[PDB]
Amino acid sequence: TPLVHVASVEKGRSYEDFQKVYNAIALKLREDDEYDNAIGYGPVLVRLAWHTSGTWDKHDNTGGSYGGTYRFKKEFNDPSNAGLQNGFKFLEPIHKEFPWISSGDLFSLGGVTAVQEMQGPKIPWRCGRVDTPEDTTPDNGRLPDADKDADYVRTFFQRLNMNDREVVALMGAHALGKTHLKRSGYEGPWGAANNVFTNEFYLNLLNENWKLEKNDANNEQWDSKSGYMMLPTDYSLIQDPKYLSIVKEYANDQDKFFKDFSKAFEKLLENGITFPKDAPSPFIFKTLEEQGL
């Protein structure tokens, strides 16, 4: 039967403590602006939060964000995690300054901070993930393949307890960053902005003229004359009629996408965690801009 992971608040800590950690992440995001040809660390931090959470298996409550297990070599050397060492290195000085925060809390908070600082929706966030030992590290192979179709995507996300709307909303994070050939065997950005969180992914899927091509790694990807790309799994969202309707909805309603993304992303980051009835309410952090910082 499933493991139980009970959220336990870092001793004596409250909203103000976590806002300080948020602020340190946000300030470093602003400072270290030349990483990845001036994209900055925002996208890789979102990907780190997702891959550290996305190992979860609803059937037995293995993997997931709780244990912060990416810090162990089996997980940080997962071929699916290639490049995420950059997000981990970014977070190192943060963890040094705030050694009291758990690894799971830091990885998930990095993702929340990145989305909000890149002008995305507010993502409520709860503390209390607790570091678990090396033998709790999930095996490689729990993160999704990119060369597959809509049926694969739908089935895959059932393991994370996500439905069609939640899947399409989550994939909207591909507005951010790019594929890097040496990391994943795919090359190129999904859009123009790269470090601003918008509904551009959906607009690009629908509005661009896509050609199925082979990249320099001999893998198929969909390319547009604008210099954008889509993975086979991204493109599957417009091949499947159920996914397509949701893509159209998000392409035509920025607010609805923001709201749905926020819920799904929080859910992703919280999967596998039992919050005590008297745990604090989720925190909604202010951006640097909102603070006048």
Ligand code: HEM
């Ligand atoms: C079918 C599901 C998914 C597949 C197959 C997939 C696959 C990929 C691949 C192959 C890359 C490129 C890695 C590289 O070469 O650097 C990537 C990047 C990225 N992924 Fe996804 N992904 C999926 C879902 C998601 C989700 C649910 C999120 C978050 C909500 C997400 C966030 C990101 C971000 C922000 C990047 C950019 C990373 C960077 O620029 O360094 N992805 N993904």
